[PDB]
Amino acid sequence: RVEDALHATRAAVEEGVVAGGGVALIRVASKLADLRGQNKDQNVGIKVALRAMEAPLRQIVLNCGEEPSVVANTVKGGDGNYGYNAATEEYGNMIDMGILDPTKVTRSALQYAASVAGLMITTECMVTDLP
Amino acid sequence: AAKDVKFGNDARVKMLRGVNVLADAVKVTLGPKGRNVVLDKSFGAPTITKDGVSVAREIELEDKFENMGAQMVKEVASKANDAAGDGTTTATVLAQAIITEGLKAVAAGMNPMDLKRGIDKAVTAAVEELKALSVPCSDSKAIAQVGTISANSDETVGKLIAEAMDKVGKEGVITVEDGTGLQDELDVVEGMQFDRGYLSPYFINKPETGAVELESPFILLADKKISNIREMLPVLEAVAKAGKPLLIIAEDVEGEALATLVVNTMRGIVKVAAVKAPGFGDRRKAMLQDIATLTGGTVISEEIGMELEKATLEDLGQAKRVVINKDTTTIIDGVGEEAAIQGRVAQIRQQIEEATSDYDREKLQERVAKLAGGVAVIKVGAATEVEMKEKKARVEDALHATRAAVEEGVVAGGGVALIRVASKLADLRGQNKDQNVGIKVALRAMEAPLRQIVLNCGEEPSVVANTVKGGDGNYGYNAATEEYGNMIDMGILDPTKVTRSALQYAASVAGLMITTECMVTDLP
Amino acid sequence: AAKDVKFGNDARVKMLRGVNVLADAVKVTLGPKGRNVVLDKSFGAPTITKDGVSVAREIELEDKFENMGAQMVKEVASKANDAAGDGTTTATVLAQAIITEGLKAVAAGMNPMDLKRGIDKAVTAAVEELKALSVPCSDSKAIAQVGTISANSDETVGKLIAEAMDKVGKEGVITVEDGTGLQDELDVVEGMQFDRGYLSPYFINKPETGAVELESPFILLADKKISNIREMLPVLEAVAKAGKPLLIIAEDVEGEALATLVVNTMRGIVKVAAVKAPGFGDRRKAMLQDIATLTGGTVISEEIGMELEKATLEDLGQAKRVVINKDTTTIIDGVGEEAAIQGRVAQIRQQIEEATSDYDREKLQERVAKLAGGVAVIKVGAATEVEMKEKKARVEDALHATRAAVEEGVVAGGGVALIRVASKLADLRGQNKDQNVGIKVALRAMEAPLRQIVLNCGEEPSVVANTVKGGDGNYGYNAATEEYGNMIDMGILDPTKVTRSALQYAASVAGLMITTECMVTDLP
Amino acid sequence: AAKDVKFGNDARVKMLRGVNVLADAVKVTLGPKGRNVVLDKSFGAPTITKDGVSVAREIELEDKFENMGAQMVKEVASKANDAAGDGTTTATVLAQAIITEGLKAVAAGMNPMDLKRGIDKAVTAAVEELKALSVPCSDSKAIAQVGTISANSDETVGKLIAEAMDKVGKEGVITVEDGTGLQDELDVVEGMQFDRGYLSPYFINKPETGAVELESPFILLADKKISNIREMLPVLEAVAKAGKPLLIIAEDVEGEALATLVVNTMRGIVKVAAVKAPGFGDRRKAMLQDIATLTGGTVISEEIGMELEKATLEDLGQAKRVVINKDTTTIIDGVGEEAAIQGRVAQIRQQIEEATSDYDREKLQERVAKLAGGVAVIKVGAATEVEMKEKKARVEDALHATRAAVEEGVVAGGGVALIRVASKLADLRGQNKDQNVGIKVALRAMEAPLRQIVLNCGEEPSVVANTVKGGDGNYGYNAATEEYGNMIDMGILDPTKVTRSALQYAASVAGLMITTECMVTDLP
Numbered sequence A: 001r002v003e004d005a006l007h008a009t010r011a012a013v014e015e016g017v018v019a020g021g022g023v024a025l026i027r028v029a030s031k032l033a034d035l036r037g038q039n040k041d042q043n044v045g046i047k048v049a050l051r052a053m054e055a056p057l058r059q060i061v062l063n064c065g066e067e068p069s070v071v072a073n074t075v076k077g078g079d080g081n082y083g084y085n086a087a088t089e090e091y092g093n094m095i096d097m098g099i100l101d102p103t104k105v106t107r108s109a110l111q112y113a114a115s116v117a118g119l120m121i122t123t124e125c126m127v128t129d130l131p
Numbered sequence B, C, D: 001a002a003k004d005v006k007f008g009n010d011a012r013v014k015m016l017r018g019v020n021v022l023a024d025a026v027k028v029t030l031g032p033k034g035r036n037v038v039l040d041k042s043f044g045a046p047t048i049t050k051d052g053v054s055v056a057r058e059i060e061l062e063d064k065f066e067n068m069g070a071q072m073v074k075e076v077a078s079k080a081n082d083a084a085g086d087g088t089t090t091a092t093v094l095a096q097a098i099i100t101e102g103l104k105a106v107a108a109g110m111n112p113m114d115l116k117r118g119i120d121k122a123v124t125a126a127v128e129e130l131k132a133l134s135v136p137c138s139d140s141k142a143i144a145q146v147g148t149i150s151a152n153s154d155e156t157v158g159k160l161i162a163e164a165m166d167k168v169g170k171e172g173v174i175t176v177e178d179g180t181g182l183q184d185e186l187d188v189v190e191g192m193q194f195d196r197g198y199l200s201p202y203f204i205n206k207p208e209t210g211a212v213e214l215e216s217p218f219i220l221l222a223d224k225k226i227s228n229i230r231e232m233l234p235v236l237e238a239v240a241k242a243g244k245p246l247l248i249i250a251e252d253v254e255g256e257a258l259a260t261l262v263v264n265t266m267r268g269i270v271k272v273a274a275v276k277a278p279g280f281g282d283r284r285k286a287m288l289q290d291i292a293t294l295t296g297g298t299v300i301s302e303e304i305g306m307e308l309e310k311a312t313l314e315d316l317g318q319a320k321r322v323v324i325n326k327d328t329t330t331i332i333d334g335v336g337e338e339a340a341i342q343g344r345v346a347q348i349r350q351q352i353e354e355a356t357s358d359y360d361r362e363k364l365q366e367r368v369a370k371l372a373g374g375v376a377v378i379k380v381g382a383a384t385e386v387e388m389k390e391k392k393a394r395v396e397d398a399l400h401a402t403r404a405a406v407e408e409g410v411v412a413g414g415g416v417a418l419i420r421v422a423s424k425l426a427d428l429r430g431q432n433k434d435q436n437v438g439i440k441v442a443l444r445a446m447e448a449p450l451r452q453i454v455l456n457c458g459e460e461p462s463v464v465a466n467t468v469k470g471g472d473g474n475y476g477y478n479a480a481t482e483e484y485g486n487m488i489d490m491g492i493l494d495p496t497k498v499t500r501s502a503l504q505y506a507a508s509v510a511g512l513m514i515t516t517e518c519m520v521t522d523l524p
Helices: A002-015 A023-031 A040-052 A055-064 A068-077 A103-121 B008-027 B052-058 B064-083 B088-107 B112-133 B140-150 B155-168 B233-243 B255-264 B281-295 B338-354 B358-373 B385-408 B416-424 B433-445 B448-457 B461-469 B496-514 C008-026 C052-058 C064-084 C088-107 C112-133 C140-150 C155-167 C233-243 C255-267 C281-295 C338-351 C358-373 C385-408 C416-424 C433-445 C448-456 C461-470 C496-515 D008-027 D052-058 D064-084 D088-107 D112-133 D140-150 D155-168 D233-243 D255-264 D282-295 D338-354 D358-373 D385-408 D416-424 D433-445 D448-456 D461-470 D496-514
Strands: A017-019 A082-085 A090-093 A100-102 B003-007 B037-039 B047-049 B173-178 B185-189 B192-194 B212-215 B218-225 B246-252 B272-276 B317-324 B329-334 B375-380 B410-412 B475-478 B483-486 B493-495 B518-522 C003-007 C036-039 C047-049 C174-178 C185-189 C191-194 C212-215 C218-223 C246-250 C272-276 C317-324 C329-334 C375-380 C410-412 C475-478 C483-486 C493-495 C518-522 D003-007 D037-039 D047-049 D174-178 D185-189 D191-194 D212-215 D218-226 D246-253 D272-276 D317-324 D329-334 D375-380 D410-412 D475-478 D483-486 D493-495 D516-522
Touching: A002 A100, A002 A103, A017 A023, A017 A103, A023 A055, A023 A068, A023 A082, A023 A103, A040 A103, A055 A068, A068 A082, A068 B461, A100 A103, B003 B008, B008 B052, B008 B064, B008 B088, B008 B496, B008 B518, B037 B052, B047 B052, B052 B064, B052 B088, B064 B088, B064 B496, B064 B518, B088 B112, B088 B433, B088 B448, B088 B496, B112 B410, B112 B416, B112 B433, B112 B496, B140 B155, B140 B385, B155 B173, B155 B185, B155 B375, B155 B385, B173 B317, B173 B329, B173 B385, B185 B329, B192 B281, B192 B358, B218 B233, B218 B281, B246 B281, B255 B272, B272 B317, B281 B317, B281 B329, B281 B338, B281 B358, B329 B375, B338 B358, B375 B385, B385 B493, B385 B496, B410 B416, B410 B496, B416 B433, B416 B448, B416 B461, B416 B475, B416 B496, B448 B461, B448 B475, B461 B475, B493 B496, C003 C008, C008 C052, C008 C064, C008 C088, C008 C496, C008 C518, C008 D003, C008 D516, C036 C052, C036 D496, C047 C052, C052 C064, C052 C088, C052 D516, C064 C088, C064 C496, C064 C518, C088 C112, C088 C433, C088 C448, C088 C496, C112 C410, C112 C416, C112 C433, C112 C496, C140 C155, C140 C385, C155 C174, C155 C185, C155 C375, C155 C385, C174 C317, C174 C385, C191 C281, C191 C358, C191 C375, C218 C233, C218 C281, C218 C317, C233 C246, C246 C329, C255 C272, C272 C317, C281 C317, C281 C329, C281 C338, C281 C358, C329 C375, C338 C358, C375 C385, C385 C493, C385 C496, C410 C416, C410 C496, C416 C433, C416 C448, C416 C461, C416 C475, C416 C496, C433 C496, C448 C461, C448 C475, C461 C475, C493 C496, D003 D008, D008 D052, D008 D064, D008 D088, D008 D496, D008 D516, D037 D052, D047 D052, D052 D064, D052 D088, D064 D088, D064 D496, D064 D516, D088 D112, D088 D433, D088 D448, D088 D496, D112 D410, D112 D416, D112 D433, D112 D496, D140 D155, D140 D385, D155 D174, D155 D185, D155 D375, D155 D385, D174 D317, D174 D385, D185 D329, D191 D282, D191 D358, D191 D375, D218 D233, D218 D282, D218 D317, D246 D255, D246 D282, D255 D272, D272 D317, D282 D317, D282 D329, D282 D338, D282 D358, D329 D375, D338 D358, D375 D385, D385 D493, D385 D496, D410 D416, D410 D496, D416 D433, D416 D448, D416 D461, D416 D475, D416 D496, D433 D496, D448 D461, D448 D475, D461 D475, D493 D496, D496 D516
Parallel strands: B173 B375, B218 B246, B246 B272, C036 D516, C174 C375, C218 C246, C246 C272, D174 D375, D218 D246, D246 D272
Antiparallel strands: A017 A100, A082 A090, B003 B518, B037 B047, B185 B375, B192 B329, B212 B317, B218 B317, B317 B329, B410 B493, B475 B483, C003 C518, C036 C047, C185 C375, C191 C329, C212 C317, C317 C329, C410 C493, C475 C483, D003 D516, D037 D047, D185 D375, D191 D329, D212 D317, D317 D329, D410 D493, D475 D483
């Protein structure tokens, strides 16, 4: 527990902290609604990315046996650090509830997921050995 | 014949499966954003429609057990439609939700009978919240408002309906037919309507509405049952000549007589329609005379010793038009002289003084009401036949609807009436755990409708349901505009009566499948 | 390697099926009236048995997923036996009961987690009901009625245990072995026992008790982990000579030295058993010196710069006999000097004084207790070898059994302890309905033992379960004679510790499976 | 190893299929009109044999479950031959009748445990009836009549056996070996015989008898368990010289050592055979001294601190011949000096005077009986070794046979002893319906033997059974001459002890199988 909490606070000291339960990703995406690109296609790309950022939250909520769609929308409506505690099914400030994530973990996961998803989306050919 | 028997859960799943096919094919038309269903015709091009009622008639499955599942619920839904005029489409999704959850409870080890009582108690509770929720529709401004919305915002239709209604009264009988050209028309004519439909389909020559419509027909009135068309011949040949149809009202019409008829009017040889006399016993025969008088015919009763063979054409009563439903026959403009008529009316009316019983008095008043009350006839004007028959359609519908609204008021449309009432029923509990789950299955299913529609619009069902529930009274979501607000105010509403029937009926067939332990069918 | 993943319900069904197999094969022996199971052996005639632990040991399924379900519970079931000494067979029908109903409810759409928490509450509340229901076994008279009951009414065995425990203690280490002639001997010797077992099976030469038994072995005491059997050589040949066994007590033995021992010893090349040092940190090295002093050996610590290569036979400790369980090593009759020993006890006993803490003090008393306390040895007398090994087995068992009775007392057996405990928690409810259902699955499962037992006797379960539930305190049904009465008076009982264990372990393993949404194994 | 589990009815039927194959293959040799069975042999022509025991030994079925049914009973049947010296052939038929009816009863839904307890009460009752029916065999005139009958009417054997037994007494160790020339020899030598057999087959070099035979061997007596053939080295090379065999009498020989000798002795390198020392505890080391003195050898122990490595040929004891059975080692003509022998006999017989208990007295007298008592040696004459090896075999059998006759007497043979006892137990009843059916399954089964022999003669089983049942005492049916009369008088009889073992062992296995609910085996 020490090794983990240790590792974690490493990242907190390094990049601070944000709401966990992946509500951070949903707050961030919700602030970028007007974000657009150069041509329609890049836009669909932007909305796809923005759409993916709720996944964390939806999946979790899905796991408590509550409605993903409802909580994601409800969470999106607030501002700052307002989110949903999965452990208690209560809405409030995620940080205050203690539930949270190192700014570094939410960040790394996001950038990395987008790197690999983009590569696959642009893949046109696959070669492997015969079974 | 050799049968195939499947039992319990094994049976229940087949059934469930069949109702899933009927309901899922049907549920995509629900709401204002419903999808198209393409129904193939052996001849030509397919029919594309968004009418749930149309899709259900054509659904028939190859598996004998699944089809039994689909067909059982298909029938208990047509009854919702006969009663109110819509909700067939609604009634079905209600049933699918309950059967699916119910059967899970059962397979899961919970008791079907407790589950049924709970569901039913939930439906009963639901009907009660639905009445306090109901907003009255009595004055003709609202009748006008109701007719206009039901006719797709054509104030013309609304005016028509309110007018017809003001003329024959809220309870009055109103018929609607093709127009004589651009302009609209309303004329009350000597008539009567009883609680009796066709003794057999086939006589039907208007498939759209599933009804029989005869013009300038002869009416054979016989106080007895005609099992032998041997007696019919003379009168039928007299009806054969002149080139006019025939209506037959006898105590009953069975086998051969009815069979040869079902065949012959269908061959083009003389169009004839048969229907059971209204009521039963003594009062039935008096009501037989109540018709002979109105149309100017003569009842041919064996009692007075008159035979059918000795019938000619003057004994045959007559009118301008007659419509016969699955369960209703309506006589339009009888030739009977008013004199003869108001005198038959005066009579009944005095019998109202000699009535030594409240009941008897009510039975007599019912008849007088019918004859002197007459029948309203709306003839719809519009310029070039296409628009005319179409406006005819919108009128028939808004009319049946306004009938129901006037009978039970209106409630929020778009499936929200149902979600609101159920939200009012959460603490509703029953006599044991099993029943409680039943009440909740019922409470849950009430959201289905609303959900499916939201589903058709491309928005999330769980969100809208959750949002709408949090409100009160007639607050709901407008599927057309995707805007929340008071549903009544916006125009999306439904007659208290259709939502109530689709639900009660949904609970009946759901109660039955859920409480079924066995299925027998023919061998493939 | 490429894997096969099955998910959600699909995944839950493989598991239920595997556990059903384990459960149905095992539950048939349960009772006074249990059925024989035939377990085949590659060589010869097969084994016929009524011992649930054995059969389960043999259960293994061809289907990889089904296999996982059964093995999950087979694993946790054995832990009930290790902590109690019986009840693997009980615990089993229990996981099966919970799992069956839990997965049905989960499939019906109830929340797995809420249900797990409800079950958990039910077990907790239930263990509570169980300790109150519990009746103590303290005075050597009860150790006696009980010890005899475990021995199958051999009063001789009971006497043996109340006396053996009387010499050392309720908490007293007692070991049992072969006898010298007809008569029963008990001698207290210098000795000790710790919380560590063999570092690997294979070292086992007594597959029936699943323990290692070495007589007159050398004991190697080093203070460090040994991974290279390169360091061993100088001492292992010295042990190969004199053709005597060797017990290895080190901080831990990994990879190379451990595998080479598990093999070389599995070949008859001088027998050598390995086990971890007692405790951790500083107090660990301290206990190793206690062991040295006790056995007259020398602790070889790299810290004193000693080397295992520099070890001669003299530095080895020695004792007349050692027994190594799955989680216990016990050294019987060490050659250590009574002077050496009591002096190491004087030391430890002064430190107790200089104890600045309640914990350092507690750890120290633990140490003095082990040394000065010694180890009891029961040599069983029978006369004619067959009777001897048999009467010996009954003693080991009754010993372990009574150990549990002294510690937590006793409760009604025949699975009724469970049927009373659940019966008093009827009203236990939770925070939500799912959790509520969970309490009921747990409480329903507590009747399984009883029900199954009744069935094997060939009587009606439902009736007996009901009848039993109706009485109070320790009133039940005696499966041998089919008579109802106080279970304890009629002698059919179970240690509060074992019944508690079987139940807790069943809910643990049942609980993990329910919440399981996914399963992964190698392909076929 | 992934297992295969079969349950209830599915498992029980496989078991039945297997014992039916064993039994029908075995039942055909029964009695004097038995048929022939051919056992294929990989090299040369098949062996034709009417000896049922040989046949059961070759029987092994392919289906793991089927095989299980047969191997269980094949094994307990051999216990019948071990305890008597014949009757395997009998016992198999008895278990088959019980199992078939038993499984019928279990399957019709009757309780297995009740049935078992019922079969056993019938058997217990049967054993008692058999002792009363039993006629004693104590005077040597009868023993001679018995010996003659077992040898197939060769009076010479009857004489021999009578003489040898008169020489060592009714309980005397009597041995039989090949003769020196035409003439029967009988000589008593110093020798002893203990209750311990070979520590492993393979050491067997006379497969027909299934026993070990070493001539003029060295005897290693070691008081300690020997686990490493490392210690055996020094002494193995010394027995390797002089080319003489060896017999290891240790506390026990396990793993390492046992394996090296089983391999080596099978490779013809130094023939060695090991057996455990007699008894347990103290009296064991004492009897080891008895054997050391008897063979003129030295007990090498660790207590005195002597080692296997420090043993020379002088420590080996020595004897003219040793026979090692499945559970018996017997030493013939030890080289010990009689002063020494008789002196040991002296001290022991002086210990008996110092015997403080009855138990200690029994044990000491046992020891002296064997030593000073000795071992009778029958050397068979014949002329031309063909006849000689034959007459020798007939002696081993009539001897073992006669042994049973003197211990418990004899009863009618031809399977009628069993039938009489059963006809007398018709009224045995139990506690409930099921146990009764059981007593009857048993009572029905004791006729199997007789019916089968009768079948083999080609007569109607039902008939002979009815008829035999009608008489009393030893009146039965002589299968060889097809005449009814006194079985005893006509020469057809059986040692009461063998009919007994066959019955008791048959019901035990019948009961266990009938009380089996599950079977576990490896995957093919």
